[model samples]
Target: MILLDENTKAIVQGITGRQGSFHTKKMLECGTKIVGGVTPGKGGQNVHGVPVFDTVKEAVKETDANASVIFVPAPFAKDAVFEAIDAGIELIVVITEHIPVHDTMEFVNYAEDVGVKIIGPNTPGIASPKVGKLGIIPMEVLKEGSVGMVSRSGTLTYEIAHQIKKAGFGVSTCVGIGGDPIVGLRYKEVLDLFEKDDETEAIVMIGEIGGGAEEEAAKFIEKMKKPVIGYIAGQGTAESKMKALEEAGAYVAKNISDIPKLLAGILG
Candidate 1:
C-alpha cells in the first residue's frame, strides 16, 4: 500500500530561489533523489549541480520528474500548481502561504479535473521516515515505524509525533494536509489509505478550529472500523477577531473543545 515507489522522482518549482535552494540542499543532504528544479530564466543554471529549467514541462521532460514541490509566492502559487499539473506531474506540494481562497478553489478544481494529487498551499509537506522527505521539518525528530500520522497543522503534527514516539509508537508516514480552505487532499483520503495499509496499524489525525473538514471526517468515521485518534487545536484562544477569522464563520466556537472527546467516543 505504499503510495510512492522508488521510481517516483521530484522537482522543485523555485529551485533557484532562497526557500527552494535551502530545502533542495537539505533534501539532497538527507539523500533524497531530487532530479532537478524549475525557475524561469534559470534553465541553464545549476544550483549545487542540480539542473534548473525554465518551465515545469522542461524539467519533467528532461529529468523524468513525476512529482514537484512548489516554493513560489502566494499570489502566483495557483499558476505554479496549474503549470505543474499541465506538465503532467502526478503529485505537487505547495509550500506557499497567503494564497487567495478563490485561487485555491480554482486550482483544486483543475487538479481534480487533471487527476493530480496535491499536498498543500500552506503545508509542511509529507515525509517517509528513514526514506525521504519533501518539506521543512527537522529530520531528527522522525523515525520509521507502523503508525500513520496526518494533520491540518504543521507544528502540531510534530508535537503529536513526539507524543506518539514517547508513548512507544513511531510513524509509517506523516502528511500535513494544510489549513487552507482548498487543498489537494483531505483527512478521509489519508485515513482510507491508512486503513488499507497493512503496515499501518493506527492513525492519528490532527485538526484545527476552522473548517468542517473535521466534521466530515467524523461522519466518515462513524462507519469506519479502525483505530483512529483525533486532536483539535485552538482550545485556549480568546474570543477575538483572530478567532473569528480562524473559525471561518462556518463552525461554532463552542464545539472546538469537544472534538477529541468525540473522537475518543467514536473509537470506543
Candidate 2:
C-alpha cells in the first residue's frame, strides 16, 4: 500500500486547462515524475513535454502511471475520477472544488470498494519532502525529518509545517486531507500509517469542527506506537474538544506555535 514515494509516477487530468497546465508545470519543476496527462481530444500532444491523452486509460497504457490529479472543473470532476479509477490509477488526488456531494460519495465508495486510496476533492494533496509531491502545498516550508503531519485545512498545513521546520524539526509525510466534511483520508487512517512508518517518530494532527475524525483519532493515539500531537480547529475551537483530544491521550495545543514545543518534548 505504498502511496506517494519518490518513484511514484503521475498523470494530470485536464492538462489542457489553465489551472491544470499551471500546476502541471509546478509539479514537474519540483521533481515530480509527471509521466502523462488527460485532456480530451488532446491525444498525441504534450503539456510541458509530458504526453497528453484523451482518456486516463490511454495514458496509463502508454506511460504506466499509477497516480492521478484532477484539475477539471467541478461539474466534470466526478467523471474524471471515474475514468481514472477505470484505468487502474491507484492513487487519485481530486483537487477539484465544489464537486457535487453525491458525486464524491459515489467516487469515495468506488475507491473504497476497489481498495483505492484518494486524497481529496478540495485538498492540496500529499507530500514526502525531498521525495515527491502530488498537490499544491508550498514545498519551501517542508524539510526532511521524522515527524508526520495530517491536517484538514490546506493553508494551515503549510503554516504549521513552516513553524515546525523553524523549530529544527522536519516531516516524514505532510498530508492535507481536504477541508470538506466528506474527504478521502481521515486522521486515524494517516496515523495508522505513521505509526508503522519507520521514518515517522511522532505525528502532528489538526482537525476541524464537528465529526469524530479527531476524537476517533484520539482513540487510536491511546495505543499508537508513536506520540500523536493534535489540535482541533473550526468554530468550536476550544473547550470540550480540547479536553476530548487530551483525554484520548493526545498532547493538545491551543495555538499552532505550541505544536513544535510539544513535538520537541516528544522527540527529546
- The number of the candidate with the highest lDDT is 2
lDDT scores of the candidates, listed in order = 0.73, 0.84
Model 1, position 78: C-alpha lDDT score: 87
Worst 10 residues of 2 by lDDT: 232-241
Every model's TM-score: 0.82, 0.94
The true-versus-predicted C-alpha distance at residue 202 of model 1, in Å, is: 1.1
Model 1 residue 207 lDDT? 68
lDDT of 2 by residue, 1-268 (tens): 5667866899999898998998888888778889999888999999899999989988999889999988999999989999998889899999888998999998989998998888898999888876768878777898888999998787767778899999999888888777676878777788887887888898888876766667667777888878878776653445566777788788888888799899879996
Q: Write the per-residue lDDT of candidate 1 for residues 1-268, one digit (tens) a residue.
A: 2343466688988888899899988877766678999899998898878999999888888899988888898878889999999989888888888899999999889988888888887888887665677777656667777767788887666766665565455677788887787887897777777778666765666667665777666656655556665556676232342233234322222343343343334333
Quote the positional error of residue 71 for candidate 2 in Å.
Answer: 0.8
RMSD of candidate 1 to the true fold? 6.1
Clashing pairs in model 1, backbone N/Cα/C closer than 3 A: none
User: What is the model-wide C-alpha lDDT for candidate 1?
Assistant: 0.73
